[PDB]
């Protein structure tokens, strides 16, 4: 038994809720929150800017030190950093950005990072401003992630469509 509330169960291991990932992290304080990162860990907008804003920019300060030491992530890759005031840990995961020409086949690689963590609060990778089809992203999530994932879908209307079209 964990602390996630009001999620609809899609599979043995995948749960979904129409909710803002920021407000959910603040309430639950999960072990792992997933950020929809880019390879530079430049958290300007979407999940990354909203998560970063909620940390008062401490996520961006930590991230800049990480990049100065290690260089950029790979598309499909990840790193574990602090969760600040939102979670124990933040798993920064880089899904492909369709609005930049990145290979959508890298979405499966991106979701494989989640398998290193027993439980996660996450957004749909490559959905929203990343320009990929969220229905596809949910299918890849269900078919790739084997650990327990709690998906926070921000768009109400999208949430209803994801549930109603789920196979
Ligand atoms: O779930 C969706 O509706 C699409 C992917 C998401 N995009 C964002 C953007 C922000 Cl600022 C906050 C949470 C989310 S989750």
Closest by CA to 18, choosing from 30, 8, 9, is 8
Q: Two tokens at 72?
A: 């950029």
| Rounded-to-integer distance, Cα 84 and Cα 29, Å | 10
Q: Two tokens at 59?
A: 């996520």
Q: Using the atom order of ligand 1, give the atom closest to the CA of residue 49.
A: 11
- Asked if 43 contacts 102 with a C-beta cutoff of 8 angstroms, the reply is no
19 lines ligand 1 (CB under 6 A): no
123 lines ligand 1 (CB under 6 A): yes
Q: Which residues contact 97 (CB under 8 A, 6 or more apart)?
A: 38, 75, 126, 130, 131
Cα 17 to middle of ligand 1, angstroms:
12
The resolution in angstroms reads 1.0
155 lines ligand 1 (CB under 6 A): yes
State the method. Answer: X-ray
Cα 12 to middle of ligand 1, angstroms:
24
DSSP reduced 3-state for 58: helix
Q: Two tokens at 113?
A: 């990072």
Q: Using the atom order of ligand 1, give the atom closest to the CA of residue 129.
A: 7
Burial (0-12, 13-18, 19+ Cβ within 10 Å), 131: middle
């Amino acid at each position: 038994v964990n602390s996630f509330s009001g999620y609809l169960k899609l599979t043995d291991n995948v749960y979904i809720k129409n909710a803002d990932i920021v407000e959910e992290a603040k309430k639950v304080k999960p072990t792992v929150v997933v950020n929809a990162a880019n390879v530079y860990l430049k958290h300007g907008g979407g999940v990354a800017g909203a998560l970063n804003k909620a940390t008062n920019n401490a996520m961006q300060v930590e991230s800049d030190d990480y990049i100065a030491t290690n260089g950029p992530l790979k598309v499909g890759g990840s790193c574990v950093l602090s969760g600040h005031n939102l979670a124990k840990h933040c798993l920064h995961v880089v899904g492909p950005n369709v609005n930049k020409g990145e290979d959508i086949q890298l979405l499966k690689s991106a979701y494989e990072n989640f398998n290193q963590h027993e439980v996660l609060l996450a957004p749909l990778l490559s959905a929203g401003i990343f320009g990929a089809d969220p229905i596809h992203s949910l299918r890849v999530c269900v078919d790739t992630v084997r650990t327990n994932v709690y998906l926070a879908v921000f768009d109400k209307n999208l949430y209803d469509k994801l549930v109603s079209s789920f196979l």
